[PDB]
Structure formats: C-alpha cells, structure tokens
C-alpha cells in the first residue's frame, strides 16, 4: 500500500526561510509547496531565540500550497520545524537568524494612564481593566519597527498591536484582563528600548 | 521689665545630649521661673541650615514647652534667648539619628482616582490633589515625613497621615505653576528616588 502522503516531496522557499538573515521587528512570510506530497496536515512550529514557542500563521492557498507568516520581534536564532502528515520535510528544522536594525537605545518612551503622563515609568502595580497607553518616539532610531510582546500570567506571549503613526512614533494600547504578573517587552529593530522590559503586577 | 537670661534652664527629650530619633516629633521644657520677665525666642536650624518651625507653648507658670519635628538626620542647632540674651548652654547642638531602612519603602501615587504605581511626575496639574502613599511595612522603626519646596522658594512641611498599618499618606495640591521638589524621608533618610522633581502646569 502506498502512503497517503510523502513529506520528502514538500518544498519550502521564501523570505521567511532566508538562511542569510532576516530583519528583526518586521513580519515575514514563506511558502510551502505540498502539491506533490499527497494528503496530510501541515504543521509549523517556531522556537524563538529565548526558547519560547512563537505563533506560526498558516494560510491555505487552496491549491496544495500554503503561506506561513511570523513576527521575529527579537533578534537571534529562530528554529522552524515543518512537518507534513507528521513527518519532517526536507531541510527542516530551518535555522533563521533575525538581525538587529537601527538603534533601539535612541528610542524615547512615555507612559500614560487615564490621561496622566508618567514619563518612562510603569508599575510595579497596574489595575485590571485599566488601559495603559505607551508611546515610543523612534525618530532617532533609524531602520526598524517597534514591537510589543506581553508575557501573561498564564504563560502566553501576546503580540500587541503597535500603531505606526509614521511620525517616527508608535502607540501601544494594553489592558491587563486578569490578575497576576505581566512582562511588557518593547523592542525596536529586535532589541529592548531603554526601560524595557516593564515588570508589572495586575491587581484589583 | 527686668530679666536675667543666665537663670533660664532648658532640658528635655528635644535637647537630649545623647541623640534623638529622626522622624519623630519631640519636645523640651524651658524653665524661666527665676529669670524675671522677658520674651522667649527659639530658633532652630536643621542639618541643611534651613529654619525649622519651633512651636512654643507658654504654660502660664514661668515655664514653656517647645516642640519640633526633626525630619532629617544630622545636627540641629537650637538657639534660645530670653529678653534677647542667649541662655546658658545655647546654642544646643542635637544629633538626630536615622532609624529603620528607608530603602525598603514603596511608593504608590494616586491622582484623579487612578493608581499610577511608583510614578510621580514629571508633570502635575495645578489644583489637582496628588496622594502619595508610602508603604513602610518592611522599613522597621521610623515615620514618613515630607517637605515641599515651592517655586517661590518656600519650604512647606506637609503633614503626613499615619494609617497605623505600616503605610502613610501624603496629600498635596500645587496651587501655582512652576517647579516643585517633593522630599520624602523615612526615619530621617530619603526613600528611593527622593527628592522628587515635578512641574506644575495648567
């Protein structure tokens, strides 16, 4: 009996698998071509440079190919394991280097709660359900984007939307929905900005 | 109106030659019963050389009770005169000693009903009350004191409420625009990040 799938026939390509490096802080995509590999489930696992799982968004293109996207928020080595029908595809695991860009040290951060400016200050205590607005001025930071990653008490890593105003500035809006310890990590071009990470405890 | 300052005697906890604990209000007694009739004056200079308020109670019996708050550690110089003449052993040089561990105090700021964590400034709004709660639960022996330096140069001793659970509340509203310096000490020493510099704006 011939197997229903053949992972050895899956082909991968695209910017997100460039072994010569990708720029940190920018979302990136790659393509998986399973048209010759029969019928199976495509799975993609990503381990970030700190050893934590990272979300891999898989889009079914309808024709036997798939587009996978992820956000290398931090610089360093990303390990991407790709399997089809439970079997690893050729060249997996991929080892992708996210390279730093710009100068995160030149970013300026100001925090506001309820319209009260706090400067580059947050916590240690925050209130559950109270929105925090964090503005990052990256006018002098050069090439790169601001990313915000929140480590939640339950252990998840949330990629928080960063509004790019194109002023060279960025706005971050976050509200802690549950009690416990959060780590609010703000990076530019893959590296911490001054005062990041912010460790906070949500209460009340 | 004859007086003799050389017959005035001064003693008490506030003049203890072995030292006093910083951050606690203290009192001393001036006995002028043998010194005739004259005006008593008490001038206190703190370790930074600033005048410190001296509350004088005339006891109506030839004696007076004087009280002051040594908010910071160091030498306090207390000059006492009767009828304009310095009394024996004046000026008194009293050492206020630190107590507890001010570095273990934790700050919580509240403005307009919002808890702002340990984040005071850089700006405050004129006429808007700020509540600064100092958690001294892990700081041991001592009290929280606070002095505010205003734009015009005045030095205001702000009354600090002791909640008797280890925490203290400071209430302050900036009435005028400009730069304020908020000094917060525990047991005579600056808590972390004190003094706090803030700018009052419209």
Swiss-Prot record, chain A:
Domain of life: Eukaryota
Effect caused by changing residue 142 to S: Does not affect sarcomere structure or contractile performance in mutant induced pluripotent stem cell-derived cardiomyocytes
Repeat (Filamin) residue spans along the chain: 2-98, 103-202
Tissue expression: Highly expressed in striated muscles. Weakly expressed in thyroid, fetal brain, fetal lung, retina, spinal cord and bone marrow. Not expressed in testis, pancreas, adrenal gland, placenta, liver and kidney.
Impact upon substituting residue 7 to T: In CMH26; increased actin aggregation; localized in perinuclear region of cytoplasm
Post-translational modification: Ubiquitinated by FBXL22, leading to proteasomal degradation.
Location(s), subcellular: Cytoplasm; Membrane; Cytoplasm, Cytoskeleton; Cytoplasm, Myofibril, Sarcomere, Z line
Other comments on record: Silenced in MKN28 and MKN74 gastric cancer cell lines due to aberrant methylation of the gene.
Subunit description: Homodimer; the filamin repeat 24 and the second hinge domain are important for dimer formation. Interacts with FLNB, INPPL1, ITGB1A, KCND2, MYOT, MYOZ1 and MYOZ3. Interacts with sarcoglycans SGCD and SGCG. Interacts (via filament repeats 17-18, 20-21 and 24) with USP25 (isoform USP25m only). Interacts with FBLIM1. Interacts with XIRP1; this interaction is mediated by filamin 20 repeat. Interacts with KY. Interacts with IGFN1. Interacts with MICALL2. Interacts with ANK3. Interacts with SYNPO2.
Name used for this protein in its record: Filamin-C
Gene (UniProt): FLNC
Residues of the full protein shown: 1534 to 1736 of 2725
Swiss-Prot record, chain B:
Subunit record text: Homodimer; the filamin repeat 24 and the second hinge domain are important for dimer formation. Interacts with FLNB, INPPL1, ITGB1A, KCND2, MYOT, MYOZ1 and MYOZ3. Interacts with sarcoglycans SGCD and SGCG. Interacts (via filament repeats 17-18, 20-21 and 24) with USP25 (isoform USP25m only). Interacts with FBLIM1. Interacts with XIRP1; this interaction is mediated by filamin 20 repeat. Interacts with KY. Interacts with IGFN1. Interacts with MICALL2. Interacts with ANK3. Interacts with SYNPO2.
Name under which the protein is recorded: Filamin-C
PTM: Ubiquitinated by FBXL22, leading to proteasomal degradation.
Role, per record: Muscle-specific filamin, which plays a central role in sarcomere assembly and organization. Critical for normal myogenesis, it probably functions as a large actin-cross-linking protein with structural functions at the Z lines in muscle cells. May be involved in reorganizing the actin cytoskeleton in response to signaling events.
Region of the whole protein represented: 1535 to 1736 of 2725
Transmembrane segments: none
Spans of repeat Filamin: 1-96, 101-200
Record's miscellaneous remark: Silenced in MKN28 and MKN74 gastric cancer cell lines due to aberrant methylation of the gene.
Compartments it resides in: Cytoplasm; Membrane; Cytoplasm, Cytoskeleton; Cytoplasm, Myofibril, Sarcomere, Z line
Tissue expression notes: Highly expressed in striated muscles. Weakly expressed in thyroid, fetal brain, fetal lung, retina, spinal cord and bone marrow. Not expressed in testis, pancreas, adrenal gland, placenta, liver and kidney.
Mutagenesis / variant outcome for changing residue 5 to T: In CMH26; increased actin aggregation; localized in perinuclear region of cytoplasm
UniProt disease link: Myopathy, myofibrillar, 5: A form of myofibrillar myopathy, a group of chronic neuromuscular disorders characterized at ultrastructural level by disintegration of the sarcomeric Z disk and myofibrils, and replacement of the normal myofibrillar markings by small dense granules, or larger hyaline masses, or amorphous material. MFM5 is characterized by onset in adulthood, clinical features of a limb-girdle myopathy, and focal myofibrillar destruction. Myopathy, distal, 4: A slowly progressive muscular disorder characterized by distal muscle weakness and atrophy affecting the upper and lower limbs. Onset occurs around the third to fourth decades of life, and patients remain ambulatory even after long disease duration. Muscle biopsy shows non-specific changes with no evidence of rods, necrosis, or inflammation.
Gene that encodes the chain: FLNC
Family classification: Belongs to the filamin family.
The organism's place on the tree of life at top rank: Eukaryota
Coiled coil: none
Taxon lineage: Eukaryota, Metazoa, Chordata, Craniata, Vertebrata
């Amino acid at each position: 009996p011939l197997p229903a799938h053949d992972a050895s026939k899956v082909r991968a390509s695209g910017p997100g698998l460039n072994a010569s490096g990708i720029p940190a802080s920018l979302p990136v995509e790659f393509t998986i071509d399973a048209r010759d590999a029969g019928e199976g489930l495509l799975t993609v696992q990503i381990l970030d440079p700190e050893g934590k799982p990272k979300k891999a968004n898989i889009r079914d293109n309808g024709d036997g190919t798939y587009t996978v996207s992820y956000l290398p928020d931090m610089s360093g080595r990303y390990t991407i394991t790709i399997k089809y029908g439970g079997d690893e595809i050729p060249y997996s695991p991929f080892r992708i280097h996210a390279l730093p860009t710009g100068d995160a040290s030149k970013c300026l951060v100001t925090v506001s709660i309820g319209g009260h400016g706090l400067g580059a200050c947050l916590g240690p205590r925050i209130q559950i359900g109270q929105e925090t607005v964090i503005t990052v001025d990256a006018k002098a930071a050069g090439e790169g984007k601001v990313t915000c990653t929140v480590s939640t008490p339950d252990g998840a890593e949330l990629d928080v939307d960063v509004v790019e105003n194109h002023d060279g500035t960025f706005d971050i809006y976050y509200t802690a929905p549950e009690p416990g310890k959060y780590v609010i990590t703000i990076r530019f071009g893959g590296e911490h900005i001054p005062n990041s990470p912010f460790h906070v405890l949500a209460t009340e």
